[PDB]
Design a binder for this molecule. Structure first.
Ligand SMILES: O=C(O)[C@@H](Cc1c[nH]c2ccccc12)NS(=O)(=O)c1ccc(N2CCC(c3ccccc3)CC2)cc1
Ligand SMILES: [Ca+2]
Ligand SMILES: [Ca+2]
Ligand SMILES: [Ca+2]
Ligand SMILES: [Zn+2]
Ligand SMILES: [Zn+2]
Length: 168
């Protein structure tokens, strides 16, 4: 695993998230399911706990956007960058943005929201990119023939526990 330069991290283990808005591509329940599942992957292997805010400023603000959307990294239309998220800290840090010029799916065929979101939360928590081809935090997007076979790698577990420790 790799962390980010200067090893940014949360210095608290109760985190909040807000889903600021929603993609046209999936029902809200499917997006919520992807986000919750994405949070749970990391929750499971750490002392971190998450709760949702429906207003105000949460730690991890999650949103869907296209092209220019208010930060240093405008999205790029269909393909290429699918999403991004910022390392732990205040304001934009911790936030995760999804390119709504992708077509978001819960299936095996398109751009899978759960898999991307789980990866992005890893960033939001302070994991950078892994050299392990099997890791969630590997830099190149792929999916699975069987989404039920998803498992967080030991490399990812090691990385996140390097930041926050194992579960209590
Ligand atoms: O978050 C990104 O990486 C951003 C933005 C981005 C581009 N340069 C960067 C340099 C530093 C930080 C962010 C970026 N690029 S991106 O949108 O192209 C991207 C998104 C997701 C992924 N996955 C990797 C493998 C994965 C998986 C693993 C195990 C089992 C099943 C599935 C699912 C998600 C990779 C790359
Ligand atoms: Ca794109
Ligand atoms: Ca934030
Ligand atoms: Ca879209
Ligand atoms: Zn952005
Ligand atoms: Zn990444």
């Amino acid at each position: 695993f790799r962390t980010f330069p200067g090893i940014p991290k949360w210095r608290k283990t109760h985190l909040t998230y807000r889903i600021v808005n929603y993609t046209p591509d999936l029902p809200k329940d499917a997006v919520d399911s992807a986000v919750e599942k994405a949070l749970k992957v990391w929750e499971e292997v750490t002392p971190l706990t998450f709760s949702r805010l429906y207003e105000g400023e949460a730690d991890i603000m999650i949103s869907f956007a296209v092209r220019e959307h208010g930060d240093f990294y405008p999205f790029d239309g269909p393909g290429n960058v699918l999403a991004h998220a910022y390392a732990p800290g205040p304001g934009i840090n911790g936030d995760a943005h999804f390119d709504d010029d992708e077509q978001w799916t819960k299936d095996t065929t398109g751009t899978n929201l759960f898999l991307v979101a789980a990866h992005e939360i890893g960033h939001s928590l302070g994991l950078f990119h892994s050299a392990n081809t099997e890791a969630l935090m590997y830099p190149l997007y792929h999916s699975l023939t069987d989404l039920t076979r998803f498992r967080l790698s030991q490399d990812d577990i090691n990385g996140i526990q390097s930041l926050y420790g194992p579960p209590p």
